[PDB]
Structure formats: structure tokens, C-alpha cells
Symmetry: C2
Subunit: 196 residues, 2 copies
């Protein structure tokens, strides 16, 4: 996928280039994961993909307790050396969520990378999106509310362009994949995901 980046409190000069590269390379070669709602962004598939890539690179992971069993895996955290990676795709309250995480951060870790998906992707209801997270952080930054270094990453794709897509069907009850296919497609014109 493609990515848009917003750095706060000079996360760019603080971040270990190699640690950032591991995250960046993983995201760039990663296809768009989608599932039925028709086709919507699949955060669990996405986090599973990220996890399988970073675990072998020695990133320690932790999966936050979901407000709903079938939501488990919608958000995931990774840590390595002094870097914290927080994938936030759920509808958990953004500012409150991070204010709470910020507290622990200040009580070691020196920079945090937050991964979100662009608004262009149709998704679960009220689920966080990049532009919204950026707006909120731009606002706090404006009044010097926080000093923690943050690299905010937005997962996006260009419109009307052939891309690799992974379509999955889950039997959410224990979660199971009953069907999956790796096809080609693109996003039309929020956007609409089209498969070939």
C-alpha cells in the first residue's frame, strides 16, 4: 500500500532509520486487505499481515482487549528497542485512547508510530481514519499539548490504479477464515473497492 506521513515533535529526526525502514517496507509491499461489510477495509487481515512480517524481525507484540470479541485484533501494538508502533483501525475514542497510552508512555520508549488507514477506504462504522487522527493531533500540537514524538502514518492507495487485493470471509463466532482470494482490482471515485 502507499502511505502518507505526518510527524509531530520531530519524530523524523528521532526515529532509528532502520527501525522505520522495517515498518515502511512492510507497509509498502502489503496489499489491500478487504472483506464483506460491499467490500470494506479488513483491519484483522491487515494486522495479521503486519504481525507475520514483524515478529520474525523481533518486534514484540501485544493485542489490546477489544470492547467486543469479534473486534479483537482490530488494533495491535508492537515494540522494539525504543520504538512503539500502534496500529489503530477501530472506533475506540482517539484522543482518550492516546491520552491514556501517552500517560504510560511517560511512565525507555522515545518515539511512537501510529498507523491508520485513509478515509478513502469504506470501513467499519465510526472507525478511526488518518485525516481525522491528523486533524486532532494538529489541534493538540497547535497548543503544545503533548511533546511525545509521533510519526502518524496513513494507509492509502491511488484511485483508478491496478493494485493487489486480498479478499477474506470470516466465520466470526473463535475467528475463522472460510474463504479468501488474492486478486487484482482498484478503487473507484468514499471510494468503492472493485475486484477483477
Amino acid at each position: 500500500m502507499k502511505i502518507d506521513i505526518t510527524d509531530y515533535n520531530h519524530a523524523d529526526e528521532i526515529l532509528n532509520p532502520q527501525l522505520w525502514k522495517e515498518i515502511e517496507e512492510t507497509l509498502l509491499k502489503m496489499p489491500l486487505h478487504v472483506k464483506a461489510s460491499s467490500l470494506i477495509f479488513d483491519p484483522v487481515g491487515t494486522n495479521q499481515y503486519i504481525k507475520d512480517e514483524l515478529v520474525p524481525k523481533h518486534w514484540k507484540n501485544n493485542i489490546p482487549i477489544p470492547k467486543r470479541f469479534d473486534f479483537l485484533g482490530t488494533d495491535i501494538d508492537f515494540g522494539k528497542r525504543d520504538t512503539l508502533v500502534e496500529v489503530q483501525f477501530s472506533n475506540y475514542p482517539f484522543l482518550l485512547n492516546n491520552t491514556v497510552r501517552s500517560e504510560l508512555f511517560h511512565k525507555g520508549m522515545k518515539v511512537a508510530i501510529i498507523i491508520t488507514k485513509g478515509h478513502m477506504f469504506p470501513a467499519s462504522n465510526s472507525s478511526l481514519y488518518y485525516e481525522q487522527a491528523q486533524n486532532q493531533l494538529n489541534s493538540l500540537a497547535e497548543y503544545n499539548v503533548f511533546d511525545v514524538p509521533i510519526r502518524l502514518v496513513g494507509l492509502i492507495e491511488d484511485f483508478e490504479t491496478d493494485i493487489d487485493i486480498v479478499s477474506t470471509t470470516y466465520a466470526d463466532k473463535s475467528r475463522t477464515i472460510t474463504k479468501r482470494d488474492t486478486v487484482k482490482g482498484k478503487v473507484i471515485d468514499r471510494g468503492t473497492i472493485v475486484t477483477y
Copy 2:
């Protein structure tokens, strides 16, 4: 105008019925104030109307310093006895704005009334709206973040219904009214304000 109300921390049992009545009666007989952007919600006209009604009823007022001269008057505060009324129509960061106001509130006032306008009204860019403020407060309430009693009020109008409208044109430079008319209209189908 019509109003929708959401109470937090039992603002409803704490609020002086007469103090609430002064606020409620003012809002109910108040027409929809609009101006050119075509026609959009006019917060200054609205606050001027509210101010002219409450000052004679002994509500002390205070107008917050705007982040922009021509924005001055977009938000206004009123106090009387133990009640705080905060009209919030601007794009100032909601949670941060109120967290800061909350701090002073806890350092007397016993309940706060926050007035916003519904999402149905086309308005200034990124300006706060009722449904958004409610979502954010519902979220903080969910995790017992604040205990301050709040009555959140949303200014709305029914669709396809004849209503009184005040259309104004300002020479924003010192603010001046160069043109104004009191007509009839309605909101079609965000919504679109139509005048007759």
C-alpha cells in the same frame, strides 16, 4: 428553533427549572439566522439574538478571544447564579476546549449548558456540530472521564417545514450589517436553506 437535548451526569436533576426555562424559551422562539457562505448558519447573528434576550434577564456575558478577528462572537458564554451557558459554534477543538474550561470549572458553578447547532445546517468549515459533540461526550461518559453535569443542547429545525429565517450580510473588516431581511423559508432534504 427546535432543540435536542443530551444530559450528562444528571444535569437534568441539578438544573434550576427557572434558569433552564429562560434558556429554553429564548431558543424556542428564536428564528434561524443565516448568511452567505449559498446560505449558511450565522453564529454571530445567533449569539447576538441570545445575548439581547439574556442580558435583560441578568445573565452575565463574556466573549472568548477568537483565533481570528472576523470569528470574534462565534462563541459566547453566559453565567447566572450557579449555571454556565456556553454557546459553541466555532471550529475550536471541542475536547481540548472543554477540558480547559472544565479545569476552571473545578477551580460556585454546579452545572453547564452547552449550545451547539445540528449537523443538518450547512456551516463554516470544521465548525462544531451537535452530533459530533454528543459523540465525543458519550465517549468520555462511557469511561467515567468527567463528572461535571452538562446539558448538551442541539439547535435544529424540522425539514420541509415553514420556519422564520433571518438573512444577514456583514461587512467584516469592526463588523457591520450592510443588509438584513426577515423572511420565511425551510430546509430541504447536508440540508439546504431555502428562502421565499
